[PDB]
């Protein structure tokens, strides 16, 4: 459950993001392919490799749909639910990938952010991030 | 685990300007504060009721030193971290009973620290061999487990 | 997120258990503790031997815990909210014991009820039990 | 992993009494069933869209055969796990990539069909056990992890 400072936390971090956000995105992407090579079967579609105008892409969609539960903190099972049901009912996506990527995303912000990854803060995008997570999952059948 | 040399370069090189002093303080210091939990190991070190007080608690920063000394042991033994980590793991498996979840958490928590430090020279290749490392050392801590 | 169907095995499947409720509850207490040594060193006060009237009691105020969760599944983060606090705060339990305790009242209710525990209902258990467990580990701090 | 002699007999004694061309394919559906992410890896079995179909699926019943017959072999092999599974954990982790914790999950599932098809007769030492037992399985299937 987040608390409000959770709420001012993520919101604060996130939007120094800006322009940056479909970039960032697509790094934490490769970072998850490199440090994590199950996680590439789910993409035999993509060429993952760097520069890849792919995961560039990809990683814009991923970016937007992490702006719209920071926008929807308090509302997330519902504006996410339509990427809910397309991770694991029709992906499949095994539970144990949103923890390694919900990671790779922490590591591309602290790469990037510095002034704003504080303790306080990182425990905040944590907790943020395993909500998400906790929603994209939360309909297995 | 398997580290090509060139990981092996990497690791070591951004090593080579890690600050050993407070490095180790700062990952246990966010371990405690991100997983909660973990608190119930350091009831001893006192005041830890808010971010600030557990980054800025003295035996927070002191143990932390120990810890990341750990590592850079498994980092110049990088082929045999089994018997590197043999009497951590006695004393975190069968004395402490620490879930060795844990380990991979807190070497979770360092590459985060990391990436911090390092920004931009924090590359994807670089926190890939990292990755290997934190997973060899995680995975030997808990042999007492296996 | 429960669905309809899960709430009412649920509730079917735990009203099987009737006047065994502490019985079954201090039986799955048992099996963790003999299954996962771990856990016993959270109670370093309670004798953990077969027959312990210690463990046969905290059964009943666990087994009462989940009739509670049970009886208000709609409302649980409220229904157990003081005890998340105990469990996190205080008992600073270490949340991957709570899929160990878990998975024993399922192998518990699979050894007492197996004309009630098909292969649905175990799939509705599991994700109550697994509900419950994310409320008790929703209060760190 | 370490079995008493009293743990071994009460094991095998169980396990005598399995029926070796059922349990394994009600272990593997419910495993389908229950944790749903997994039936990924099954594509090429057709239905699996309800419990029923899961079921009643031949291909979930004779997969579940095989699987079964591989936990027979470590109980014959408590001594030696890891060797009796290196092709499956080569084929499992290095061909098909299946997270290990998959393997715990598929561990406390035969658990809970054994609860559920001895009833009393498998008392809290039996399972303690069988736990033990999957246990090793699922750490020797994940060495190529390790
Ligand atoms: C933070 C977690 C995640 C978010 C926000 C997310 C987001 C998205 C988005 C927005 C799409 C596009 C949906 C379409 O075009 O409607 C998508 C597609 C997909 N995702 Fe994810 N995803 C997440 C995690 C994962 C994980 C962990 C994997 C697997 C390792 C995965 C595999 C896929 C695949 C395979 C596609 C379809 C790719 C297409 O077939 O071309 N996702 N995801
Ligand atoms: C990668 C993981 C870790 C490394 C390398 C590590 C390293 C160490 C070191 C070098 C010592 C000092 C031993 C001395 O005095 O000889 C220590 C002590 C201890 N560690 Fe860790 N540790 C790890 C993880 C953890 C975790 C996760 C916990 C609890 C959450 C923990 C709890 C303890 C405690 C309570 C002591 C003090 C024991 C005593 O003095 O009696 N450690 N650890
Ligand atoms: C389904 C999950 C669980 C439920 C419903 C549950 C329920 C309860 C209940 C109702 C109490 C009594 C609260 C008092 O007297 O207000 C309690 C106490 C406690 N629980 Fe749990 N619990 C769960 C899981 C766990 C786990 C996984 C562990 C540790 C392995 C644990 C350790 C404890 C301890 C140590 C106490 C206090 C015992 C006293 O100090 O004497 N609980 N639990
Ligand atoms: C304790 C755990 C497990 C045991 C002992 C086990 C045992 C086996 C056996 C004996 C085979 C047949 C190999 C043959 O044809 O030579 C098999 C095949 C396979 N298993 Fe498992 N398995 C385990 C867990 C799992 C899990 C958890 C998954 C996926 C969720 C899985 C997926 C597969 C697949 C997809 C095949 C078919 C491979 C092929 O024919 O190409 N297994 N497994």
Redesign the interface.
């Known amino acids: ?1 987040l608390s409000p400072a959770d709420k001012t936390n993520v919101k604060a971090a996130w939007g120094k993001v800006g322009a940056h956000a479909g970039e960032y995105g697509a ?1 934490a992407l ?2 998850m392919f ?5 996680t590439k ?1 789910y993409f035999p579609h993509f060429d993952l490799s ?1 520069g890849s105008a792919q995961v560039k892409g990809h990683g814009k969609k991923v970016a937007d749909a992490l702006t719209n539960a920071v926008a929807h903190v308090d509302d997330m ?1 519902n504006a996410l639910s339509a990427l809910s049901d397309l991770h ?1 009912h029709k ?7 949103f923890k390694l990527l919900s ?1 790779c995303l ?3 912000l ?3 952010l ?1 002034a704003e ?4 803060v ?2 905040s995008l ?1 907790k943020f991030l395993a909500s998400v997570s ?1 929603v994209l999952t ?4 | 685990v398997h580290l090509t040399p060139e990981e092996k370069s990497a690791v070591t090189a951004l090593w080579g300007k890690v600050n050993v002093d407070e490095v180790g303080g700062e990952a246990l210091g966010r371990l405690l504060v991100v997983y909660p939990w973990t608190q119930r190991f350091f009831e001893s070190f006192g005041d830890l009721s808010t971010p600030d007080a557990v980054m800025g608690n003295p035996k927070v920063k002191a143990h932390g030193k120990k810890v990341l000394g750990a590592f850079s042991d498994g980092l110049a033994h990088l082929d045999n971290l089994k018997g590197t980590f043999a009497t951590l793991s006695e004393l975190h498996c069968d004395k402490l009973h620490v879930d060795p979840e844990n380990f991979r958490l807190l070497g979770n928590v360092l590459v985060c620290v990391l990436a911090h430090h390092f920004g931009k020279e924090f590359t994807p290749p670089v926190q890939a061999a990292y990755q290997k490392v934190v997973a060899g050392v995680a995975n030997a801590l808990a042999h007492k487990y296996h």
């Open positions: 459950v790094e490769e970072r490199l440090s994590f090579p199950t079967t760097h099972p694991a992906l499949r996506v095994d539970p144990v990938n990671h922490l590591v591309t602290a790469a990037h510095p990854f504080t303790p306080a990182h425990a944590d906790t939360s309909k297995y059948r």
